Paper text:
Influenza A virus of the H7N9 subtype continues to cross the species barrier from poultry to humans. This zoonotic ability is remarkable as the virus retains specificity to avian-type receptors. To effectively transmit between humans, the virus needs to acquire human-type receptor specificity. In this study, we show that recombinant H7 proteins need three amino acid mutations to change specificity to human-type receptors.
We also determined the crystal structure of the Sh2 V186K K193T G228S with and without avian- and human-type receptors. Introduction of V186K in the K193T-G228S background, resulted in binding to human-type receptors in the ELISA-like assay, with some residual avian-type receptor binding. On the glycan array, this V186K-K193T-G228S mutant only bound human-type receptors, and displayed strikingly high specificity for α2–6 linked sialic acid found on extended N-linked glycans with 3 to 5 LacNAc repeats. The V186K-K193T-G228S mutant also showed dual receptor binding on chicken and human trachea sections. The Sh2 V186K-K193T-G228S mutant lost almost all binding to avian-type receptors, and binds with higher avidity to human-type receptors than the wild-type Sh2. Interestingly, the increased avidity of the mutant was seen primarily for extended α2-6-linked N-glycans, with 3 or 4 LacNAc repeats, with a 2- to 5-fold gain (apparent Kd values are given in S4 Table). Sh2 exhibited a broad thermal denaturation profile with a melting temperature (Tm) of 55°C, while the human-type receptor specificity mutant (Sh2 V186K-K193T-G228S) had a slightly lower stability with a Tm of 53°C. Thus, while the Sh2 V186K-K193T-G228S mutant exhibits human-type receptor specificity, the thermal stability is, if anything, lower than wild-type Sh2 HA, which is not surprising since mutations that increase stability are generally in the stem region, not in the receptor binding domain.
Numbering used by the authors:
A (entry chain B), B (entry chain B), C (entry chain B): 1 to 168
D (entry chain A), E (entry chain A), F (entry chain A): 12 to 141, 143 to 158, 158A, 158B, 159 to 263, 265 to 276, 276A, 277 to 325
Amino acid sequence: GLFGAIAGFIENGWEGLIDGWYGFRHQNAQGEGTAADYKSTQSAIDQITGKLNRLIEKTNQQFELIDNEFNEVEKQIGNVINWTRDSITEVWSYNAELLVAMENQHTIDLADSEMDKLYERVKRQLRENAEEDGTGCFEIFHKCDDDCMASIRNNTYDHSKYREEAMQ
Amino acid sequence: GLFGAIAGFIENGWEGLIDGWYGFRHQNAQGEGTAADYKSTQSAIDQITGKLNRLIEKTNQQFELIDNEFNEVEKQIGNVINWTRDSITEVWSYNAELLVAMENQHTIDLADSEMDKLYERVKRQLRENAEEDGTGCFEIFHKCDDDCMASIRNNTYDHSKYREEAMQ
Amino acid sequence: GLFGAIAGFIENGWEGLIDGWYGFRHQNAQGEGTAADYKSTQSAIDQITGKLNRLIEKTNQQFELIDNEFNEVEKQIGNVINWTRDSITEVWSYNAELLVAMENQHTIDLADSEMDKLYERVKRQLRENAEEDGTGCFEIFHKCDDDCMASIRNNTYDHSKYREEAMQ
Amino acid sequence: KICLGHHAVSNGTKVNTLTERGVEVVNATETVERTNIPRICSKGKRTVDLGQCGLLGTITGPPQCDQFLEFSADLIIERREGSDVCYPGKFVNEEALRQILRESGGIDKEAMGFTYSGIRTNGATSACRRSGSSFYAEMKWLLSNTDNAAFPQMTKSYKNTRKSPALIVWGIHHSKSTAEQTTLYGSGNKLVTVGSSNYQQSFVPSPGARPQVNGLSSRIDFHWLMLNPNDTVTFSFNGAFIAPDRASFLRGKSMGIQSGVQVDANCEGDCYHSGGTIISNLPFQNIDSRAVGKCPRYVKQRSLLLATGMKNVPE
Amino acid sequence: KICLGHHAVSNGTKVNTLTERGVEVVNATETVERTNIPRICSKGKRTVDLGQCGLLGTITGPPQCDQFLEFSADLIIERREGSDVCYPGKFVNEEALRQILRESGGIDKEAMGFTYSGIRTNGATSACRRSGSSFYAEMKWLLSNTDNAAFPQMTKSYKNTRKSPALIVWGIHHSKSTAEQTTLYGSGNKLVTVGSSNYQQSFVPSPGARPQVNGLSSRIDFHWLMLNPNDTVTFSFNGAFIAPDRASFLRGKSMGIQSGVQVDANCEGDCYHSGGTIISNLPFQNIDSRAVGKCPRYVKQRSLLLATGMKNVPE
Amino acid sequence: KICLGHHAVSNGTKVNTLTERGVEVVNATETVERTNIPRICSKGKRTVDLGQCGLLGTITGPPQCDQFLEFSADLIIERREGSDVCYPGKFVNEEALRQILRESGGIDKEAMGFTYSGIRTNGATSACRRSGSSFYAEMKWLLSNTDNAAFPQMTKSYKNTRKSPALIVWGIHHSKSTAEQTTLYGSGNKLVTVGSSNYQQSFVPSPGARPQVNGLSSRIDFHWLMLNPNDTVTFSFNGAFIAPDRASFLRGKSMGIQSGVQVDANCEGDCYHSGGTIISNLPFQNIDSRAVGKCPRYVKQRSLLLATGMKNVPE
Ligand SMILES: *[C@@H]1O[C@H](CO)[C@@H](O[C@@H]2O[C@H](CO)[C@@H](O[C@@H]3O[C@H](CO)[C@@H](O)[C@H](O)[C@@H]3O)[C@H](O)[C@H]2NC(C)=O)[C@H](O)[C@H]1NC(C)=O
Ligand SMILES: *[C@@H]1O[C@H](CO)[C@@H](O[C@@H]2O[C@H](CO)[C@@H](O[C@@H]3O[C@H](CO)[C@@H](O)[C@H](O)[C@@H]3O)[C@H](O)[C@H]2NC(C)=O)[C@H](O)[C@H]1NC(C)=O
Ligand SMILES: *[C@@H]1O[C@H](CO)[C@@H](O[C@@H]2O[C@H](CO)[C@@H](O[C@@H]3O[C@H](CO)[C@@H](O)[C@H](O)[C@@H]3O)[C@H](O)[C@H]2NC(C)=O)[C@H](O)[C@H]1NC(C)=O
Ligand SMILES: *[C@@H]1O[C@H](CO)[C@@H](O)[C@H](O)[C@H]1NC(C)=O
Ligand SMILES: *[C@@H]1O[C@H](CO)[C@@H](O)[C@H](O)[C@H]1NC(C)=O
Ligand SMILES: *[C@@H]1O[C@H](CO)[C@@H](O)[C@H](O)[C@H]1NC(C)=O
Ligand SMILES: *[C@@H]1O[C@H](CO)[C@@H](O)[C@H](O)[C@H]1NC(C)=O
Ligand SMILES: *[C@@H]1O[C@H](CO)[C@@H](O)[C@H](O)[C@H]1NC(C)=O
Ligand SMILES: *[C@@H]1O[C@H](CO)[C@@H](O)[C@H](O)[C@H]1NC(C)=O
């Protein structure tokens, strides 16, 4: 993707992350844990679903028979019809190919984007109390227990509360 | 948008910002003020106008009558014509829908992008003299009077000049 | 571009950079040097080549003659054919124009994106040992000899090794 | 320490993008429909399966079409075994007439009121059998009263007093030889002129040997026109003329298909081809480029996978 | 402290994107034109409003077309009240001929130089009235000198000595009965052969009763061909032949429309339909799929709003 | 200190994007092909250059087509100097027949086995010269044995015993006058009926003066039908009939072009127009909207530059 997170500075995904698309994996004195972030996940899901809703839209235009499978129509008008139909097929095969390729690029890029929004969100929560290691992780320069981790995940982490220790 | 500023970590827009698309809202001992940034605004405006100039381009192809509203042409050739015309309509309705949807996604995303470019520009001006609060604001760790604010807005802010105080 | 690096906070390109698309230009006590980054360059090149491979794909649909250049076919069926062919031309001229415009926007934006991924990569390597000046440069707050520069370029720079001096 | 990440799976799905072919994503979905239902899904639709009745036969009425002389339908199905004729012959501008009848919603017949004197009106043949020799149920085979008698020049007119156009059909009979034609209608060149207000055309019969079809080397040419409201059609003829007995009026709207599969009133569909019904929410299909109804757009690709998840980067 | 932000409004405009339906943006603009001007905007264009003259009539010249026998135009307007004929009849391949004349830029007439002896040349009827009985201004109704006299087999040839193709029109007269045809042209079967270098066709008249139109149960079949430069057309006929008096040559280029609205030389347009003119800078229109000229592409949607501002996030 | 940057050049290439016209990028490439090869690139393809033989002539066999009576080809080239006829005349539904023959792969001829008694079968003319007066090689000009003798009503039938449809061609001869026609075939109206199983049509000759082409004011009308396997065609005629001697069967598949340029067996191509061959990997072409084969899509633009490098920002 365009945002160089997924398949970028974040090395690979987590096959154990079964409850969401994106998440946090923590380590402290109490051990390691992994939890999913709902908001980022649902944002990506909502956007892909909107794409799907566009694509499963019903064509409400009726077309009728203009040639005959049992009794072939006159040759010349039949050659005109076949050429017209083959030209339209050319156009719709091109459109389908282009549509899916373009939409897949954008889907991949949008998922990349939601990962970065989550990473920067956490970064901005942590302020001067952490440093990025370059792999999607924040080195925390203070004791961060399970409740401390939980407050980072649900946006109740007070950087001031730990500011004094962490800079130190 | 893809850049998670507008409708992202920046909470909402300013209905009092009537002189530009993006801007600065400051607070210091002299009070609060809001001013628009011209460069970012005109960049977004120039890009949307370029899109408009593409879309109001004249088709220079002439098409003539191939059927008859007063004296219907023969049925079979008329059914071929109607089918051809309805197929082309199918194609152009699809193209118009896709074009506008795609262009609207890109317009929204481009406006999101210009907001982030302005935010990071200011961030890079301020260096170690400020900290981001996560809402689009920079906490300034030095006395910043109205002239000091004006220098941030028009890119004449010297971070060194305040470096000593701000880190302190 | 959407990422405000190329033609953005990075002022212009290097006409002396003849061995890659993106690179590092260093200055230390030993002088100045410029080298290309291969990984970012090849990522951009691979993506543009993939676009080219899509566009030079062979249409495997055969179309045959439906009118006559030496002996004009009957007028009415000829007017239907000409109108159909002109309508298809309308559609393909529109598609070609839109395709190239869209692809050019994305190519420009993707190249902008690879520049930012490289800049942030270096930023994350350097940690607290450097500060960004806002022009694409990192002010290094420690003595960084030619081997030190080389380690930044090929990702072997140990920020800890210089951490003590640089903060100081 | 705290780390951000994204999900992955052991087996992803490869898709194509603008910059890369065969990129693996966590999940994807098909956009091109390939699954066909080998029936005409007709639940909820007044359906007429013509079977052995040819669509044009519903206007003239050979025996195989007696049950279809005034049909009403939303969906009309032609079958490969259908025949428009009993006495051999064929329609002029037959396909134009089929396309009119496929979208008519059915036909409503009404007597046109022609009466005759000085001729026979009961021409019959063993090729149109109804418990013996008969003819087209909607036509009258006009003859001289006796062999070689002169067929009088005659004029028959019909005014469409209704509010929608009348489908008028007549026939030109070409006997197996000039000698057979004189016994039926008297000697000399015979002429039938057809005129209305937006139509004018003449017909002269062409006797001659033709390959024997249904035992006959003669043929009937069936012609038609649509007669506008308040307009009049006038027939001037002196023999070899198959006269219309009733006119047809179109009931409303319908669609016609050509199929070789059974009807299923338990599936619902709106996109038909000769092999069945395409029921799909997908925008494209790779089944039949000649499908009709409300259909996904036919495309040449068998598969176009649309990414529904992020790029898959496994460990 | 210093804060970055973006603008918003109390009432934005909802638009559609790839990922979302009904996203509110600060401003948007319409791409589909729905506003029609109920006139034929013809400012700056040589315009011919045919009125009661039918376009094909300009070649043969019934009275309603006398003012249009050599018209010149960039824009040709057909009206619903137009009639091509006075003596009832109709053209063969009429629509092909209309499409040729709509783009001709007008016609320039020239005498073809046929002279006759041994016949009448002044056939007239009260259906083509010019202060009495008259005929088509560009044709000559050829008759026997006296009733039932034999119409001599005759040959008339015309060489196109000009540099563009000549439009040649002739007519076949079908009298109300075989008896009336013999008084006009003498008894027996009558034949007209038409040949050039890329055309060959024969015509035999078909007398008979037709519904009375303009008091007549007879009709004239008008036929035409385009005669190439240096090529010759030869007419061989023995009666029932409406001879051409002048040939037509196409002036240049034009466009033809069919309208029911007045001409306005004070608005300028290039896209016409029967209800008026579409004047728009928009790339799409939802007004008439059969509009002609230089037009926005017809689309089925009534509205497609294009975002011209950022997402609107109000407080 | 360490700095990041990107490359640039002194002279970039301007391209267009969605938001801007004339953006300079480091490198770009053309997507619209304008370069034409002024030859028919035919390397690897069985090619038939008809030259002076008209495509329809390969079925009837005027002298210029003697070398092409049973051709085999993947690519068929018609030339502007080609003529289908020797004795003047023209085909009915000629373009339908050309399109069938362009994709046939060539024709395989077989005698249909008609034998005659009581007539002449060796009609010849100095317009079809083969070291003297001759005729179409695949036809037989049937005549009365002696001047004005009656042409007997005759019936000839042919059954297609092969597995693909038979192309059957016959001709109707229109002499220069009614008097000349009686010397060839005897007096009276003459009639030819054509019937099979899906075809029925009658023809009566039309004698008359036509402009002299190849010295003759007479013409031959060539007609055709495709006869299905196991089906029979029956000809009933009494004169003015150009009988078929052999039927044609289509060999396989091919493509036909119309060109004015030489054949080059040293270039390979699949997209042809009258001016040569379009050999290109590009998806679009601005050369000829009527190109045929496997072609880039024709577009109205002469150039559409696709960016292949980043934006160029020089110093
Ligand atoms: C326009 O295109 C249609 C095809 O979409 C042509 O009709 C098709 O004609 C081919 C032969 O040219 C038929 O192929 C045959 O298929 C059956 C198997 O079902 C079998 O007999 C052979 O395999 C043979 O190849 C095909 O059935 C037929 N399909 C349809 C739907 O009509 C048609 O000829 C073209 N129009 C003109 C005027 O040529
Ligand atoms: C091809 O399509 C056109 C329509 O785009 C068909 O012509 C249209 O025919 C319908 C009837 O089938 C006409 O509808 C009538 O509208 C008027 C009101 O203006 C009124 O009499 C009724 O409401 C009736 O529904 C319609 O006027 C007419 N429009 C045009 C522009 O011709 C045409 O029949 C189709 N071609 C063939 C060969 O069927
Ligand atoms: C359908 O369109 C074709 C064009 O794509 C029309 O045929 C073209 O007819 C024009 C005249 O109307 C020809 O123009 C002539 O070009 C030659 C130079 O090569 C010269 O004689 C003059 O400059 C003249 O303008 C053109 O050659 C011809 N092209 C082809 C490929 O046929 C055609 O008339 C249209 N169909 C109908 C039914 O009108
Ligand atoms: C994968 O995608 C399809 C279509 O979006 C969906 O029906 C299916 O449930 C998805 N499966 C998972 C595991 O996401
Ligand atoms: C047909 O004629 C009757 C008069 O008997 C009239 O009332 C009716 O309106 C006419 N309809 C049309 C469509 O002309
Ligand atoms: C809104 O958009 C339209 C079209 O771009 C423009 O004409 C109009 O002036 C715009 N209004 C504002 C307030 O931007
Ligand atoms: C027509 O014939 C004349 C000879 O009188 C000749 O000069 C002229 O070039 C010819 N034009 C064409 C188009 O053949
Ligand atoms: C520029 O682009 C074309 C097409 O991609 C390529 O063939 C050519 O080698 C390129 N040149 C350079 C210097 O990149
Ligand atoms: C044609 O007839 C023969 C009988 O002689 C038969 O064996 C063959 O299968 C038939 N072919 C078709 C296509 O009907």
